[PDB]
Amino acid sequence: QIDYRDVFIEFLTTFKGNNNQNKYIERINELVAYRKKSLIIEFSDVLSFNENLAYEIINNTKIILPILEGALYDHILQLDPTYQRDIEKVHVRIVGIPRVIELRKIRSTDIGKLITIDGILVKVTPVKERIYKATYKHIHPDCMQEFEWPEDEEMPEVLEMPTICPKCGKPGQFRLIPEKTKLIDWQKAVIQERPEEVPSGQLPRQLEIILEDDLVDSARPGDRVKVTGILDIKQDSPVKRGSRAVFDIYMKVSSIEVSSEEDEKKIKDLAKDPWIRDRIISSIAPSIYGHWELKEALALALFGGVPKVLEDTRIRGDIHILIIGDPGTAKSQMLQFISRVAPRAVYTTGKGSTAAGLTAAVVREKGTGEYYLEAGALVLADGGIAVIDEIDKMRDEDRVAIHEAMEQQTVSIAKAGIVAKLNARAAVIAAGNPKFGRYISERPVSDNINLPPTILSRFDLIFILKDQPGEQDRELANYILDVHSGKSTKNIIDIDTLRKYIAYARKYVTPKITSEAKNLITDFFVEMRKKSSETPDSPILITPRQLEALIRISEAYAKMALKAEVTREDAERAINIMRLFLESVGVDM
Amino acid sequence: QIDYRDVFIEFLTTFKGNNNQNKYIERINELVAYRKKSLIIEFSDVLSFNENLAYEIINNTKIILPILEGALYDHILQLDPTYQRDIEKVHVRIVGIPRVIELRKIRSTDIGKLITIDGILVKVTPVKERIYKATYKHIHPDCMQEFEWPEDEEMPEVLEMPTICPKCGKPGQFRLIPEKTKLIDWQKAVIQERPEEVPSGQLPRQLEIILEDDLVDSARPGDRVKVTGILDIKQDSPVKRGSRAVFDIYMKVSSIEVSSEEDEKKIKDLAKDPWIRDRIISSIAPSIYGHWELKEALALALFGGVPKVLEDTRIRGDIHILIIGDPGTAKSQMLQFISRVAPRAVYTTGKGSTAAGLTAAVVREKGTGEYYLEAGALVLADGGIAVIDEIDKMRDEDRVAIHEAMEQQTVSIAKAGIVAKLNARAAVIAAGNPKFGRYISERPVSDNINLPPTILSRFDLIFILKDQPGEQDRELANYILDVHSGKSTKNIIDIDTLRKYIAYARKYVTPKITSEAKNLITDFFVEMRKKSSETPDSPILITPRQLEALIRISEAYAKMALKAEVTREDAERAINIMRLFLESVGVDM
DNA sequence: TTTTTTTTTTT
Ligand SMILES: [Mg+2]
Ligand SMILES: [Mg+2]
Ligand SMILES: [Zn+2]
Ligand SMILES: [Zn+2]
């Protein structure tokens, strides 16, 4: 019963963070500048400042938020009167709730309480409008009266029409007036539990969440998010009894977090090391012995090149890697590691995927009867990495559907009266086996690969892996047994901070090509083309695409060290890595 | 007539266990400490204590269970007052009901009586909420009153709305109030009769069961369960009568069990025998003469290895066995025995299965038109054993769908806008015939097996069975006729005990590799690679997977004797069994 | 009819 608005104001105005700069007065300072009508407050901060205040938000969230939000609005008005007539209400979002519940463990006792759920966003609906205060006209020749139907109460989830006119007391028919109705933004989304918490032999479960007002379009499908809000039962057709007094539960989101300053200096400290590139390479798949050249190639694909957008066309900035090897060469283990360290990645297999599922699917809604597009794997991976294991097992008629997405980075659909074009700017990493399971050194490269030259030319680097039992078996066996014994390699960058390093580099680094790097790349390309003409029967063709691979690889090397330009050292590395690629496919220089 | 609450309370406090330890008193505090809010009792113990109490439960179940619930709740509160305000209702479940009825023999006379049914779970729905006490607000300009609609009575299965407002006596509009409504967890499951109970030439029958409150998520599909509760008729769509006074039936589950301390003593006593490993092997398929190396191999697959989960990757712990042999070599008979003895096994046929059915299928839901996922055979066998008979009869383009699930133990689907990953951690045992039906000694091994090297490397052990007539025919003929004569081999562990032994071993034993075992395994693997390179023509490749096979087999041998360490003795056995596998495929050592 | 994944018969 004690007043908390005064406690809120002093907490907001007076608070000391770890940085010791009064974090919480800068957020409200930016609140009036950009007019976002939403404030983020950490539960750890309010708990430290006032234990009693933190509890009251947890257990009395229903009747403490409108009071608390009203106090904040008055303080905002005092700071700047211009906020009036621009924003009517300001929302306060609380994050970091200790009450975290697994999606499968939700029971009846959790209804009506503020909880937090971690999951994967799979579906988003277009933004719509919801009525919370309607206006009606009594169509009865004596009334012609206007009244807001739900008095001193917002309109419930199910729309209800008045039966007795409050202005005359007589029944009849009522007409809604849209221009006098108050609306609010409304969006529906579906949250799926993470594969980590799925029990054995069970399919994952899904939960429906509702986003309103400024929370709409705050995330995209495939993201990993944490949602805080209140659970409630869902009503769809209350008019039809139809027995079965059983309801499903939904969630009203109060705040959403999508998966800080101390990370910047931590990343900058790593880049200061002159051997940062070697540290990153050594940190790729620490459980795999050897394969140093493959680890270097996979590191480049994670960073990628610099895309170019021009007046008339655009140039692909992503790097594609293809690996062919004998079974048991740990090709899949490295691909699994890539899908974990990448900030955004989609893992698919050759046999378990279709052309429609990879790019886009045209699906007909049974109710409406209209066709609409469904995002494929490549579309969902835009701006990230796409992994296609067992690519050689895909049907050739089905594999050609990704030819344009791999180079033009677009998906074109002309089906069922729908013509559309979707961006698919995603790097592709693929693995497969030779034609006869294992590579045969007694036969040419032409029949060993068994892939059309069109798709091969789209890959920047192609590595052929040969399992040759030699003198390294003892070293390999010792390394494997140490892994099984729990021994772990040291002096490596862990997966969590490595993911942050890649995300920062891909966002704030854009290397430029210098004059000295141009000469080295130009000379190598001329020699590469001349050497290729010696053998025309090989299925590997040196096209102008290979020249752009040199540029992309060179930029990726500079981006690893957070450099602002491509020097001659990066060009030398780019030439060296492709020399190994050419040697593997049988081209010697 | 008389009150049994005093008898019930003293029954728990005065009952004596097997060794006079009062096996009910220590359950009460466990319920209090863990707040499990559910207590189970045994009918035979109740019958052994007081015959009158047992009859009243078995007959007047609908009027004595709430009475015993109240007495139990009072006894908990006095034992620990803190139990209040956390659990407002405690359920008591009775098991071991003598009234057992087959699913196909249910008649109208059994309706409303406490009965027990044994069957197989097939379908489970997501957990929902059911209203048992609602709150309404009369939307009439004069009432604005809130009341609980069902007075002194639970809300029936049909959602019924008040017609006359009790607070004012007038009809009108009533609005449900979810905040004041009381809910209860609700789940729906389908149970199927056992295959051995189905009459000749008919499909198995199914029954619908309802699980509520703590009984939700009590089992997974494919389990064998025993459900006890009251039968009742199902009212689904009573809005329109449409004649047809015929109704279905459903069961309200009161207690459920799936598929003990006495068994642990028996299991531990068996492991004390030094020759337990040989005793266990002799118990595998007692009706099959010979094939000692195959029985030993099948025993290892039942126990398996130790899966390793690291911060960046995970290692398969299951063991895969492949058998190729001439027809009539009892391959199918031995595989059928494995399905019976394994705690969780799925039997499939190569011809009677498809790629979608083995791993996962995307099906368009008819009600909404939206695609969703259906678990395949491998997913349903997670944590168990998958048996694939006639693997050679599968289409090659269709058999490759299980390559990922057999090594990475995952299933990836990218179809119709659905991207998902599922765990398929199961062991695969497969059997098949050579290319020409029977093994041809003239031709090499490569054309006899007729399988790609990729799938062959996935199998830890491969055995080739040759039906060669010889001097052993008389011994085989005598053994078969003795089986047909009813004679049974003695000194073998029964199938029921063996299943319990395997389940205990797989849950509480995690062997570790010692230094001595590491040296023996490393030396053998190096020798294997050197020998394989000398003859680069065999269809078997010694990949690094073979090294991990030795580790998994070594752990399985230690796990068979409930040993916590892998001594040198287990390494020698693992090396010895692998030697026989190599000699079978013609790889001399 | 139409696109899609699936089991099935039959164009
Ligand atoms: Mg692989
Ligand atoms: Mg057979
Ligand atoms: Zn009126
Ligand atoms: Zn009333």
**Candidate CATH numbers 3.30.420.40, 3.40.605.10, 3.40.50.300, 2.40.170.20; the one for domain A263-585:** 3.40.50.300
CA distance A9 to A68: 10
- Strand C: list positions under 7 Å from protein Cβ: 2-7
Tokens of B451: 């399988």
Resolution limit in angstroms? 2.6
CA atoms within 13 A on the CB side of B548: 25
How far, CA to CA in Å, does B316 sit from each of A239, A282, B261, B549?
A: 53, 24, 31, 10
| Residue (of A463, A349, A455, A476) closest to A401 by Cα position | A455
Binding-site residues of A for ATP sit at 325-332
Nearest to B220 among A163, A201, A480 (CB): A201
Q: Under an 8 A CB cutoff, do B541 and A336 touch?
A: no
How far, CA to CA in Å, does B258 sit from each of A454, B191, B224, B226, B344?
A: 56, 13, 6, 7, 12
Residue type, A505: A
Tell whether A439 lies on the interface with B, counting CB pairs under 8 A: no
Per DSSP, B104 falls in state G
Looking at chain A, the domain(s) classified CATH 2.20.28.10 span: 129-183
Domain A4-95, CATH homologous superfamily name and number: mini-chromosome maintenance (MCM) complex, chain A, domain 1 (3.30.1640.10)
Residue type, A14: T
Count other C-beta atoms under 10 Å from residue A48's C-beta: 12
Looking at chain B, the domain(s) classified CATH 3.40.50.300 span: 263-585
Give the list of residues 6+ apart from residue B576 with CB closer than 8 angstroms, or none.
none
Spell out which residues of chain B touch residue A163, defining contact as CB-CB under 8 Å: 139, 172-173
CA distance A474 to A503: 38
Q: Under an 8 A CB cutoff, do A374 and B416 touch?
A: yes
- Decide: CB of A361 under 7 A of nucleic strand C: yes
Backbone angles phi, psi at B302, to 5 degrees: -65, -40
Residue nearest to nucleotide C7 (CA to C1'): B354
- Decide: CB of A415 under 7 A of nucleic strand C: yes
| Residue (of B328, B341, B327) closest to B295 by Cα position | B341
Distance A391 CA to C4 C1' (A): 22
Nearest to B407 among A332, A467, A478 (CB): A332
Reduced 3-state DSSP string for A501-560: HHHHHHHHCCCEECHHHHHHHHHHHHHHHHHHCCCCCCCCCCCHHHHHHHHHHHHHHHHH
Tell whether B513 lies on the interface with A, counting CB pairs under 8 A: yes
Taking phi over 0 as left and psi of -120 to 50 as alpha, with beta for the rest, B160 belongs to beta
State the best of A167, A191, A243 to mutate against chain B, taking most chain B CBs within 10 Å: A243
Per DSSP, A440 falls in state -
Q: For residue A173, how far is its CA from the centre of ligand 3 (angstroms)?
A: 9
Closest CA in chain A for residue B383: A200
CA distance B198 to B193: 7
Q: Which nt has its C1' nearest the CA of B413? A: C5
- Decide: CB of B364 under 7 A of nucleic strand C: yes
CA distance B335 to B388: 9
Identify the bridge partners of residue A185 per DSSP, sorted by sequence position. A129
State the best of A157, A236, A244, A479 to mutate against chain B, taking most chain B CBs within 10 Å: A244
Count other C-beta atoms under 10 Å from residue A512's C-beta: 12
Q: Please work out, in degrees rounded to the nearest 5, the angle formed at the alpha carbon of residue B270 by the alpha carbons of B268 and B273.
A: 115
3-state secondary structure at position A250: strand
Count other C-beta atoms under 10 Å from residue B245's C-beta: 5
Give the list of residues 6+ apart from residue B336 with CB closer than 8 angstroms, or none.
B347
Closest CA in chain A for residue B362: A352
**Candidate CATH numbers 3.50.30.10, 2.40.240.20, 2.20.28.10, 3.40.190.10; the one for domain A129-183:** 2.20.28.10
CA distance B366 to B371: 9
Identify the bridge partners of residue B427 per DSSP, sorted by sequence position. B385
Tell whether A286 lies on the interface with B, counting CB pairs under 8 A: yes
Q: For residue B177, how far is its CA from the centre of ligand 3 (angstroms)?
A: 27
- Ligand nearest the Cα atom of residue A334: 1
Tell whether B115 lies on the interface with A, counting CB pairs under 8 A: no
| Number of cross-chain residue pairs from A and B with Cβ atoms under 8 Å apart | 249
Tell whether A248 lies on the interface with B, counting CB pairs under 8 A: yes
CA distance B41 to B190: 25
Q: Which nt has its C1' nearest the CA of A376? A: C4
| Residue (of A512, A523, A536) closest to A572 by Cα position | A523
3-state secondary structure at position B138: strand
Please provide the distance, in angstroms rounded to a whole number, between the alpha carbons at the two ends of chain B.
82
Q: For residue B381, how far is its CA from the centre of ligand 2 (angstroms)?
A: 21
Q: Spell out which residues have Cβ within 5 A of ligand 3, the ion.
A: A 138, 143, 165, 167-168
CA atoms within 13 A on the CB side of B355: 16
Spell out which residues of chain B touch residue A222, defining contact as CB-CB under 8 Å: 419
- Decide: CB of B351 under 7 A of nucleic strand C: no
The Cα of B465 is separated from the nearest Cα of chain A by a number of Å equal to 25
Chain B window 399-458, residues with Cβ within 7 A of nucleic strand C: 415-416
Q: Under an 8 A CB cutoff, do B127 and A111 touch?
A: no
The Cα of B6 is separated from the nearest Cα of chain A by a number of Å equal to 31
Identify the bridge partners of residue B428 per DSSP, sorted by sequence position. B386
Q: For residue B176, how far is its CA from the centre of ligand 4 (angstroms)?
A: 14
Is residue A498 exposed (0-12), middle (13-18) or buried (19+ Cβ within 10 Å)? Answer: buried
The Cα of B145 is separated from the nearest Cα of chain A by a number of Å equal to 14
Taking phi over 0 as left and psi of -120 to 50 as alpha, with beta for the rest, A234 belongs to beta
Looking at chain B, the domain(s) classified CATH 3.30.1640.10 span: 4-95
Chain B window 381-400, residues with Cβ within 7 A of nucleic strand C: none
Q: For residue B389, how far is its CA from the centre of ligand 2 (angstroms)?
A: 7
Name residues 44-83 of chain B within 8 A of A (Cβ). Answer: none
Give the list of residues 6+ apart from residue B244 with CB closer than 8 angstroms, or none.
none
Count other C-beta atoms under 10 Å from residue A181's C-beta: 17
The Cα of B238 is separated from the nearest Cα of chain A by a number of Å equal to 6
Distance A503 CA to C3 C1' (A): 38
